[PDB]
Ligand binder design. Sequence first.
Ligand SMILES: Nc1ncnc2c1ncn2[C@@H]1O[C@H](COP(=O)(O)OP(=O)(O)NP(=O)(O)O)[C@@H](O)[C@H]1O
Ligand SMILES: Nc1ncnc2c1ncn2[C@@H]1O[C@H](COP(=O)(O)OP(=O)(O)NP(=O)(O)O)[C@@H](O)[C@H]1O
Ligand SMILES: O=C1CCCN[C@@H]1CCCn1cnc2cc(F)c(F)cc2c1=O
Ligand SMILES: O=C1CCCN[C@@H]1CCCn1cnc2cc(F)c(F)cc2c1=O
Ligand SMILES: [Cl-]
Ligand SMILES: [Mg+2]
Ligand SMILES: [Mg+2]
Ligand SMILES: [Mg+2]
Ligand SMILES: [Mg+2]
Lengths: 479, 477
Amino acid sequence: MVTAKKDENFSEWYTQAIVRSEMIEYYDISGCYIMRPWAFHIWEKVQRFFDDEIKKMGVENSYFPMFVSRHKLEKGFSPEVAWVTHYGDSPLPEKIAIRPTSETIMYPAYAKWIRSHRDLPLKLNQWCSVVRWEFKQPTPFLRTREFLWQEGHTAHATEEEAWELVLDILELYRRWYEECLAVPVIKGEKSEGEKFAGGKKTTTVEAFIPENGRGIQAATSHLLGTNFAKMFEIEFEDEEGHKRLVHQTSWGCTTRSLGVMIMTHGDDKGLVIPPRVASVQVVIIPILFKDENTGEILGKCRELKTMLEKADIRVRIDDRSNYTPGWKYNHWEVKGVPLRLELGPKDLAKGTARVVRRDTGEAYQISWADLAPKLLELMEGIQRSLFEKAKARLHEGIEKISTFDEVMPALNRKHLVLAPWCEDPESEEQIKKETQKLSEIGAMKTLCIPFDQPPMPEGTKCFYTGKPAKRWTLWGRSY
Amino acid sequence: MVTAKKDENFSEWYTQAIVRSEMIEYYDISGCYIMRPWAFHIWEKVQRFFDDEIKKMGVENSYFPMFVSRHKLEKGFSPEVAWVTHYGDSPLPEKIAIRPTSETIMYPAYAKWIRSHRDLPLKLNQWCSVVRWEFKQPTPFLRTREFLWQEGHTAHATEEEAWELVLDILELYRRWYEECLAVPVIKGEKSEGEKFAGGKKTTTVEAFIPENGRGIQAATSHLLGTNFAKMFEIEFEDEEGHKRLVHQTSWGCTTRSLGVMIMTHGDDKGLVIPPRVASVQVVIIPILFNTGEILGKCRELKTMLEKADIRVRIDDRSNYTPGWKYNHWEVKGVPLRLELGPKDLAKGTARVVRRDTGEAYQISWADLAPKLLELMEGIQRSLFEKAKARLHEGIEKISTFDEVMPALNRKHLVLAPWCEDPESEEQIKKETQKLSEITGAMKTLCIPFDQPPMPEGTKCFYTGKPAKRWTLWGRSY
Ligand SMILES: Nc1ncnc2c1ncn2[C@@H]1O[C@H](COP(=O)(O)OP(=O)(O)NP(=O)(O)O)[C@@H](O)[C@H]1O
Ligand SMILES: Nc1ncnc2c1ncn2[C@@H]1O[C@H](COP(=O)(O)OP(=O)(O)NP(=O)(O)O)[C@@H](O)[C@H]1O
Ligand SMILES: O=C1CCCN[C@@H]1CCCn1cnc2cc(F)c(F)cc2c1=O
Ligand SMILES: O=C1CCCN[C@@H]1CCCn1cnc2cc(F)c(F)cc2c1=O
Ligand SMILES: [Cl-]
Ligand SMILES: [Mg+2]
Ligand SMILES: [Mg+2]
Ligand SMILES: [Mg+2]
Ligand SMILES: [Mg+2]
């Protein structure tokens, strides 16, 4: 059972939620954690969703090696690279790196495979793990030294096509968070300071954690332009016979998405799992005490299960004899199962079951015949309700502002700011260092420049420099 | 085109088939290979099959870290372990190993999670890669330094329930090979010398490669007994409050299965992929050297076949003749080619050619979906049954040690009555090695579940002592 309160010590709440729900087991190698089945089933759901969707785009899965040779890799990231130096007691002739990301592993093959327009677009993805020796404080799911992800890497004849894929993938990430995990996200573009330096333009979806006021990057999708094509000699011949550079994209999203879901929907009793990604949508609990009707309770439970499955409802009967009914309520609650159905002798006689929804704790008396459609209705309710409350909290957490003098107070309130900005280079660093300084007495950075821009009245000035502002940019402390 | 003949230069045939089909891309780190979509799709297919099946048994997926501390890992195999000693320019406090297998990572967690009979059975699996710095020559799929696999590790209150699971998992590996890959395998028990030394009994599915006469272990399923439970202190209180040791199993199968399938079904033109796992089951080739008439029809045919869950691609590439395309998709092993030219358009028919035999069929458009489903089932089954007959043509039943070298020289396995005493296996290994020299060694592959009749008073082929069971032996991978 969870005892830390979400609104008091947040980090201790998160730790308790993930351990006691049996999502995570701690591990002796710092920054790495065991994903137990209750968390893994969720990853399988979002994984199957994203994967199905990219397959409709013609993206194919592959698998490239987890090792890259020193010299290929080495053609502020260097301190993060894990190096294999020995096999048994023998030193490798040359040390070898574990993949922090796969550009240096995939792009030489791309140069080889692409010869003409007939070879494009090339669209590949892989699901795998990557290793980065993160210097920031690690946190399960959100920042780990080994994490699971997919990375997609595509190559196109033209920028327009490449860019169209960038946005398509970004929309899939919106759907992963918003439609599967009921977590709202803001699409936007990274500032010049925050974008992937290997690319032309980096797009993102950004989420927000109210309890610590932290913005967090949810996924990423890069228009790479042609710089990688120039670096790796990825060229093709047009249908006219000339040699052209390819236009590339890459995109990735990780098990971080699970941590974001946990933090968003969790409460003081622990986990709350959105029905769309819950492996157990409805747990059925037989109420057994003093031998009253034991066999008839269990029988109708099996009957209800079969009925609910016809409607594609994912149902588990917890008929384990070595646990009390009250232990079961607690167990499945801390685990965040969206609906609990209880069946004792009193309920049995009536042709009804008592059903409790995990998000609000509301109980329903429902007749056996109304079950399938009532539960489907409740599950859409839960899913939509989880999302809309999270959305309202996201919007309560963002403050529209005009001047730097408004910044520090908004941060103390654990909010982000949407502020007009000239998008100058020195600016962001200045702002980072200064909010850094005022906080110590930490830093605030740009999260993104939202795609959805409020109007910009003529003559409005950059909130920091005083110069003419360009667009509204979202800022805050972040992960 | 593939030019090395499969029977005459098998090693070069293999390399040619996997590269020219675009399954595999070579790579600068030894024993590591890129798996391109044409190969990877097949992996997703067998993975989806095996995963769906173990989920029916209540096995649940998880992900344990790829790193294990030196202290945990070291609680024979030592030279194979890859060690990380630095991050960037900084030395670690102690070296950390990349997982060559996950026992030392999982079993301490199991010792914590298992306290009571009600925690049992515990049934976990993971899909991941493992790394082993193999000393033997690397071979794409069959023996790689990084490989993809699943490993299942379970714990039970009793040996009986553990053994039940061992056998159910082994039956699933038989299915993975025989049903998905159309590769016949032989269930068996490993000898004392060949079993996992950390377990009580190892079961296996064994396959045969006729072109080089070598047996190859296809997958493995172990009754671990209680020794890991002693080692890691995995105990539970039973119903009476008594501390008991759990009974364990583990099992694994790798991307090696893809290479076994390639070798089993390939021919001189290249790959033949069983319809149940092919990325493309039906390639539609328009006979063109556009107005929209032929392509238009190809799209309609595709749509109609996709309605029947047939995986289709139209090869509408501009720069290539039909004959070039035929060969291209043959080398890739697409089981069915659908040809559509002006004469076909004119007659409402399409010509279909199956990759395994080259038989051609004239089929009306209306009939395509049902006839192609039926051809795919016929191809899948016919691949299996021809490979099955080749497996059994590759095994010689013998009585005496003098029958051995002639059998091995015919690139055949041998089935012989064996007394199963510990020392004779090593002796047979050494003796067949030395005779070969005049990887030549003959070892046991498995003691098959399917035991041929054993006449009363039959002697061990080697020691002459009384013979227990028939054992299958051969050169192997
Ligand atoms: N260490 C990590 N653990 C888990 N998820 C991560 C980690 N690092 C990055 N991510 C997520 O993976 C996505 C793509 O990774 P990438 O864009 O390479 O990260 P990044 O540039 O290193 N971000 P950051 O580490 O904050 O500077 C990011 O948008 C994050 O959502
Ligand atoms: N290097 C490898 N590459 C690909 N598949 C492998 C490799 N090593 C083992 N396998 C397969 O994975 C299965 C389970 O692995 P395991 O039982 O640990 O192998 P093993 O005991 O090392 N066999 P061997 O290396 O021949 O002595 C084996 O039965 C093989 O089918
Ligand atoms: O963000 C993506 C999506 C997946 C493809 N890669 C891009 C950029 C990745 C940014 N990134 C992130 N982290 C890294 C860490 C390293 F150690 C390293 F060598 C490189 C990187 C690195 O390039
Ligand atoms: O048979 C399997 C597959 C599923 C569970 N794991 C076992 C492999 C155990 C045998 N084995 C096999 N190979 C190993 C290689 C190593 F480098 C190492 F450290 C350990 C091993 C090792 O234990
Ligand atoms: Cl070496
Ligand atoms: Mg980073
Ligand atoms: Mg950054
Ligand atoms: Mg080995
Ligand atoms: Mg061995």
